[PDB]
Ligand binder design. Structure first.
Ligand SMILES: [Cl-]
Ligand SMILES: [Cl-]
Ligand SMILES: [Cl-]
Ligand SMILES: [Cl-]
Ligand SMILES: [K+]
Ligand SMILES: [Mg+2]
Ligand SMILES: [Mg+2]
Ligand SMILES: [Mg+2]
Ligand SMILES: [Mg+2]
Ligand SMILES: [Mg+2]
Ligand SMILES: [Mg+2]
Ligand SMILES: [Mg+2]
Ligand SMILES: [Mg+2]
Ligand SMILES: [Mg+2]
Ligand SMILES: [Mg+2]
Ligand SMILES: [Mg+2]
Ligand SMILES: [Mg+2]
Ligand SMILES: [Mg+2]
Ligand SMILES: [Mg+2]
Ligand SMILES: [Mg+2]
Ligand SMILES: [Mg+2]
Ligand SMILES: [Mg+2]
Ligand SMILES: [Mg+2]
Ligand SMILES: [Mg+2]
Ligand code: NA
Ligand code: NA
Ligand code: NA
Ligand code: NA
Ligand code: NA
Ligand code: NA
Ligand code: NA
Ligand code: NA
Ligand code: NA
Ligand code: NA
Lengths: 92, 194, 237, 56
RNA sequence: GCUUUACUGCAGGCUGUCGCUGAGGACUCUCACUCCGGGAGGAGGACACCGAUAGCCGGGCA
RNA sequence: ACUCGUACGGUCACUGAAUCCUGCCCAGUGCAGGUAUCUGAACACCUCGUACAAGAGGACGAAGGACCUGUCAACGGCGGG
RNA sequence: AAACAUCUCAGUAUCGGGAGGAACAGAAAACGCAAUGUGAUGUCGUUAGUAACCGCGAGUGAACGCGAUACAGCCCAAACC
């Protein structure tokens, strides 16, 4: 589906409607320093590694909308529930 | 002033440098041709030996023991085992090489008792340790106030029961506080969990 | 499964061992201080159970009596010589260097003084080709060019018993008798005629290898069977 | 040939015999080892914890 | 029990790296080390072996 | 162990005396060889990060793979129109 | 664990080596109710199924301290001779 790059709507921070800019959430890079990372290293050994021997699941036919809404004036973003969309394209 | 001994010690802080380096390069050639347990007239590291209880006296013996380097020499399982227990290559023994050396020496001298031991180097495939043993039955020692304790009946086969210094550190008894919950008073009384 | 036959072999049990206690001599060249003054006389020509070929007994000047890898054309009474100054005739042993090229040789040492390793079976022979102050090139019976230390001793002539491979065994019994004199399990059951548990080719409603026979060099024992690291198979091209 | 009765006829070989060390007829005269006390194999007397219930 | 391109691992093989290991991206040497030689000495030589680790193969096995 | 053995050897397999013979197929799988280029781990090396460290990235790149070739008395195949 | 691989059964069964009438431990490179505080070590009661671990599933699981029992502190190496 199509969607405006910018549009007026409620900013939960200013607590008042203002122009926002929609953008897809780019994945952040991991640091390999979280507790789970330490448990992986520490708990993996000889033979099967339990949960750490498992491998990546799969994919649902269509994914949900993963967007960031940025307030045009206070510059802060907020998140919203997403909706299944095979494809999402912005307008302008 | 500095004791002459401090020079032997000081040299062994870096067995790979200077004169000691060239000495080792030479000795190991002969050591590699000696047995598994060779009695020697004099400690290769006087300061260390004396520091551990050595004494130029009747009933005091020293022996260099050679032991292979590396992990456990283990046979792969011949029956059912869950993956966790199918290992062979990465398994290491819980007794350190120095302790293995101390035992081989004591067995060689059935009548003697291990007093202590220290390392004298290694090449690419074996480690050498010199073990100090004592004759608990020689009056020279029985009358020595600094050693006669090792004469007592309860010190018999002390090495095989981990009463050696190396045996006690290996048993995780160094710390008197945090971390030694399952080591002191013994590994066995704590259900073998250390 | 169970260990395959190839694996039972390595244990060296009776069935796989050679009847060593029934063998005659460990054929090796003599050790000479130097000079060449070592000559001996052929006293008898005996049969060598380990090689199915003849061997010659020789008494040396210094009283030493030993059996020797006998080349073709050597008889009782003949005088053999071993050393640098050895003459150049059949049966005499001397370092490759002292040997004239183009001359067939046998029982060649791989390392000087090892007593001989190459070209020792019935009727075979090595062929000294090149000389040098450094390397002596020899052509072994397999056809390979081998660079050898010219100081490596060898025997002049071709090994005795040539042509043994020319006559067929004709019957199982003959194979049997020969096989009994070797460290080998015989007869041979085809893998494909066994049960899966016993061999990688075992099993099936009919007999055929369950997979391709060409196996990798890296395959483990118990699995390395069939055509080992074959660079090719068949007769085509 | 049956592996039962007919094969019992060839059994006239002597193996286990009265042991010099423990007195049990367990000294294998071919192996020169007692299957009971370990004589011929061990200076120490043969014994195992599985010879009784674990907690006993 | 058996099979395999089932899941997960474990031996084994190949390969890089570190230790043993030294002198002057290709090279010489000799002193460790290995082997041949009764010995003298020869060959090989900082490689191979062995110890450690990494990638690939891996129903041979669990 | 083979081996008191050394390619006229002996290991691993297939077929199964003699006689007349044994066609076509290398795409897949297997094995083997080669390989500009691509891919390819760890150590050491470089950068960023951290008064250190974790960590991120770079350069280099072995076997192996991609890719090319050889091979069916190698696994096997020899159809519809 | 209602399968099962980590986990669990369990450092159990069993095996190898060895001591004593008891073993082992033991006079802090401790503790860390953080203190102007405690004061070798075992053990008992408790702390507590607490902290901690764990396909964060099933399960697993201490310590300091406290109340008790009993109490005991010393010898070398080296410096200088
Ligand atoms: Cl989206
Ligand atoms: Cl002892
Ligand atoms: Cl044959
Ligand atoms: Cl306190
Ligand atoms: K289990
Ligand atoms: Mg693992
Ligand atoms: Mg106790
Ligand atoms: Mg021989
Ligand atoms: Mg034939
Ligand atoms: Mg036979
Ligand atoms: Mg057959
Ligand atoms: Mg059948
Ligand atoms: Mg099979
Ligand atoms: Mg058939
Ligand atoms: Mg067939
Ligand atoms: Mg029966
Ligand atoms: Mg040798
Ligand atoms: Mg299976
Ligand atoms: Mg048939
Ligand atoms: Mg269950
Ligand atoms: Mg569950
Ligand atoms: Mg537990
Ligand atoms: Mg605490
Ligand atoms: Mg004093
Ligand atoms: Na851990
Ligand atoms: Na002893
Ligand atoms: Na532990
Ligand atoms: Na088959
Ligand atoms: Na093909
Ligand atoms: Na092909
Ligand atoms: Na169940
Ligand atoms: Na089940
Ligand atoms: Na777990
Ligand atoms: Na209190």
């Amino acid at each position: 589906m199509q969607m405006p790059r910018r549009f007026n709507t409620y900013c939960p921070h200013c607590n008042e409607h203002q122009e926002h800019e929609v953008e897809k959430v780019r994945s952040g890079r991991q640091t390999g320093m979280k507790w789970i990372d330490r448990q992986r290293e520490r708990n993996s050994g000889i033979g099967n590694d339990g949960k750490f021997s498992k491998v990546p699941g799969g994919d649902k036919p269509t994914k949900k909308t993963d967007l960031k809404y940025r307030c045009g004036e206070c510059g802060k973003a907020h998140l919203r529930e997403g909706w299944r969309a095979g494809r999402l394209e912005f307008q302008e | 002033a500095r004791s002459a001994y401090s020079y032997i010690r000081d040299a062994w802080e870096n067995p790979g440098d200077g004169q000691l380096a060239e000495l080792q390069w030479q000795r190991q050639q002969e050591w590699r041709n000696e047995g598994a347990v060779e009695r020697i007239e004099r400690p290769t590291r006087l300061d260390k030996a004396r520091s551990q209880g050595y004494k130029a006296k009747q009933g005091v013996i020293v022996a260099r023991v050679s032991v292979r380097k590396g992990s456990a020499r283990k046979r792969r399982h011949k029956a059912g085992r869950r993956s966790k227990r199918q290992g062979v290559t990465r398994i290491t023994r819980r007794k350190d090489i120095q302790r293995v050396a101390e035992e081989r020496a004591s067995r060689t001298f059935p009548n003697l008792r291990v007093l202590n031991s220290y390392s004298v180097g290694q090449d690419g495939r074996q480690k050498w340790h010199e073990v100090i043993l004592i004759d608990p039955n020689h009056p020279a020692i029985q009358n020595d106030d600094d050693l006669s304790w090792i004469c007592a009946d309860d010190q018999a086969d002390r090495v095989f029961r981990g009463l050696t210094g190396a045996g006690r550190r290996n048993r995780g008894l160094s710390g008197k506080g945090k971390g030694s919950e399952k080591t002191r008073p013994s590994l066995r009384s704590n259900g073998g969990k250390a | 499964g169970r260990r395959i036959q190839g694996q039972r072999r390595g244990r060296g049990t009776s069935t796989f061992r050679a009847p060593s206690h029934r063998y005659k001599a460990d054929l090796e060249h003599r050790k000479v201080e130097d000079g060449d003054v070592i000559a001996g006389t052929v006293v008898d020509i005996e049969h060598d159970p380990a090689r199915s070929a003849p061997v010659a007994a020789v008494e040396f000047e210094d009283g030493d009596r030993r059996l020797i890898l006998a080349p073709e054309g050597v008889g009782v009474g003949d005088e053999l010589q071993v050393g640098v100054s050895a003459e150049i005739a059949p049966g005499n042993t001397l370092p490759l260097a002292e040997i004239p090229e183009g001359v067939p040789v046998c029982n060649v040492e791989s390392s000087p003084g090892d007593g001989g390793k190459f070209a020792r079976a019935s009727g075979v022979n090595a062929q000294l080709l090149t000389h040098d102050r450094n390397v002596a090139v020899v052509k072994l019976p397999s056809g390979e060019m081998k660079r050898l230390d010219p100081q490596c001793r060898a025997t002049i002539g071709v090994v005795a018993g040539g042509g043994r491979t020319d006559k067929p065994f004709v019957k199982a019994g003959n194979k049997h008798h020969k096989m009994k004199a070797r460290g080998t399990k015989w007869p041979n059951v085809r893998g494909v005629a066994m049960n899966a548990v016993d061999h990688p080719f075992g099993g099936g409603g009919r007999q055929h290898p369950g997979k391709p026979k060409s196996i990798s060099r890296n395959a483990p024992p118990g699995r390395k069977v069939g055509d080992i690291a074959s660079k090719r198979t068949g007769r085509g091209g | 040939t049956g592996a039962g009765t007919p094969s019992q006829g060839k059994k006239n070989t002597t193996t286990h015999t009265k042991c010099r060390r423990c007195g049990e007829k367990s000294y294998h005269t071919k192996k020169k080892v007692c299957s009971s006390c370990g004589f011929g194999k061990s200076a120490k007397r043969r014994d195992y914890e599985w010879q009784s219930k674990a907690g006993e």
